[PDB]
Amino acid sequence: QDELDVVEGMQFDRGYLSPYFINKPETGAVELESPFILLADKKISNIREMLPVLEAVAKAGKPLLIIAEDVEGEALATLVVNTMRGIVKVAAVKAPGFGDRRKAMLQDIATLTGGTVISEEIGMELEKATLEDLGQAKRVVINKDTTTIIDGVGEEAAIQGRVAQIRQQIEEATSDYDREKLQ
């Protein structure tokens, strides 16, 4: 029997580095309702202090998802230890693809999820920001390998503007490699 699957919204195939992210749903099924999505470019080892952002989300009191270069085991310990504690649920993922283009599509996701264009490789800082910069999507479902979004909070006008921006990139000149992937 053939299997029919529909994967809508935003999805990427990256797994959690920490197995302790086993959520309340059985079989390790992970679910987050209206979390805060954030973007980063650094592996958080030397600073070891996301605590201002962590406590801002704690007083916000809502689950969170982070996208970054990586998280070192020292920060990972408390980031997973603290999620147990029930303070803030945080989901950390590895970079889905190749640097420049993957980052470009992460900004598109952030615009889709109502987040702000956040790249750490510019003058802005990870801990220096405004809490509204975090993007929100109604429901996100996470398993050992697949992370998916059902429906997010974003303006369809901006989504269609990005679609118009990417319309010419649909063709480009690379053809075979670029076209089908971009479509």
Binding site: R48, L54, E55, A75, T78
Partner: protein, 97 residues
Amino acid sequence: MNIRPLHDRVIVKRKEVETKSAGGIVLTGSAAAKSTRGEVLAVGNGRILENGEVKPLDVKVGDIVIFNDGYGVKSEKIDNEEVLIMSESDILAIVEA
């Protein structure tokens, strides 16, 4: 427990470790930035400088202080107590609140 140090050698207990309360619910990893303060257990006998001799300093036993953490201090678990012997200049600033 109270054995007398001398001159710059003063004996202090370093402040609390293992961040029960220092910021949120976060736990410190192997990277430790903790107990930059202390409470002095006792001070040395005093200075000896050409009949200026011993002059008591502004720190006395029980003072909660901020110190300099370096190689000049010797840390030992003696008398069933953790204790640190540091110099006169190893004290940064003192306040009791």
